[PDB]
Design a protein around this ligand. Structure first.
Ligand code: YIW
Ligand code: I46
Length: 325
């Protein structure tokens, strides 16, 4: 057990071990940039805000610790450390998570290729563990000075990058909701503007369909909701736009990848693994250096437990933590 010290910063209190110095607020849980004396590197420290306030929070606290302890990939946030000032379960009420500080977020063709390749390389990994991100957006992509990128989950509206099947309230969405978001991000990097800046879920849907066109009969037959159908079919029919004409000036391979990512029917969207093998990333692609994840146990997601049970499970995960070499 190391020596802890207390400090108040931006209304929040921070009790962290001696090893972490020069705590500097970065976002408000609440995140601080800091210096790690044991390793010599800059770190990001997240203090969980009200971890065990409700069952929803307690399960979220557990889910985040479990997720971060599992992620071991260059393009995904990983845990350097996890600590609590608490010396027993009884005293346990605060969680701090430590990771590498990248320094900035996401908000040249070679630049875009490298940035998207990294997002896709990290998404191939998370999708392999049967995890869906569901909120990929520029603010959730951390970038260092070497232009190295990590996916995380930390104002820019979420709905701007959300797959149309989520806006339309479909419960059965798949992993490709994240490829949609990648398409949106890649477009924004290429042109310098938000592909679909909707003001609400209705407007957002109208903006998407303006580009990709209104659903064909094959997709319309897959929509069970009379309300989702009676809305979409009640809109003035729109054809699919020519992407070469909307993304005029861009590398034709980037336009071709955009067409494969931004397909309305999610069953027809390119996966992260297929996108990695697209001609656009020929300069980066190496199937021997795009690893998959170890099996991830997410059976807990289906459980309905008490705050104290989620709390005790989180505590054990803090105790069992083994730092990387
Ligand atoms: C300040 C900004 C410039 C910056 N630069 N580098 C970093 C690194 C991290 C952060 S935020 C941070 C800091 C420490 C510990 C944890 C976090 C962020 N938490 C996080 O990414 N959570 C996360 C990742 C995923 C994945 C694995 C799905 C991506 N899911 N979750 C999550 C799960 C449940 C609830 C909340 C989040 C800022 N940095
Ligand atoms: F306006 C639309 C119509 C269909 C989609 C869509 C894309 N991929 N999957 C769906 C979908 C949506 C709702 N219910 C479903 F069953 C499948 C998205 C927007």
């Amino acid at each position: 057990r190391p020596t802890f010290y207390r400090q108040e910063l931006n209304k929040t209190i921070w009790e962290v071990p001696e090893r972490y110095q020069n705590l500097s607020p970065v976002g408000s849980g609440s995140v601080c940039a800091a210096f790690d004396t044991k390793t010599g590197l800059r770190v990001a420290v997240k203090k969980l805000s009200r971890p065990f306030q409700s069952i929803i929070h307690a399960k979220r606290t557990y889910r985040e610790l479990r997720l971060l302890k599992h992620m071991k990939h260059e393009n995904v946030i990983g845990l350097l450390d996890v600590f609590t000032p608490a010396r027993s379960l009884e005293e346990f009420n605060d969680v701090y998570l430590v990771t590498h500080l990248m320094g900035a977020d996401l908000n040249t063709d070679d630049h875009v290729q490298f940035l998207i390749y990294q997002i896709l390389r990290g998404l191939k990994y998370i999708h392999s563990a049967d995890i869906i991100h569901r909120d990929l957006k520029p603010s959730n992509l951390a970038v260092n000075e070497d232009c190295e990128l990590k996916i995380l989950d930390f104002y820019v509206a979420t709905r701007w990058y959300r797959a149309p099947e989520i806006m339309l309230n479909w419960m059965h969405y798949n992993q490709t909701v994240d490829i949609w978001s990648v398409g949106c991000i890649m477009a924004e990097l290429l042109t310098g503007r938000t592909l679909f800046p909707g003001t609400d879920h209705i407007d957002q849907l109208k903006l998407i369909l303006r580009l990709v066109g209104t659903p064909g009969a094959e997709l319309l037959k897959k929509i069970s909701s009379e309300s989702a159908r009676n809305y979409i079919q009640s809109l003035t029919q729109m054809p699919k736009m020519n992407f070469a004409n909307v993304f005029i000036g861009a590398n034709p391979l980037a336009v071709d990848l955009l067409e494969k990512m931004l397909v309305l029917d999610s069953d027809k969207r390119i996966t992260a693994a297929q996108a990695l093998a697209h001609a656009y990333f020929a300069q980066y692609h190496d199937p021997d250096d795009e690893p998959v994840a170890d099996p991830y146990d997410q059976s807990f997601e289906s459980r309905d437990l008490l705050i104290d049970e989620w709390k005790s499970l989180t505590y054990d995960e803090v105790i069992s933590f083994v730092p990387p070499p």
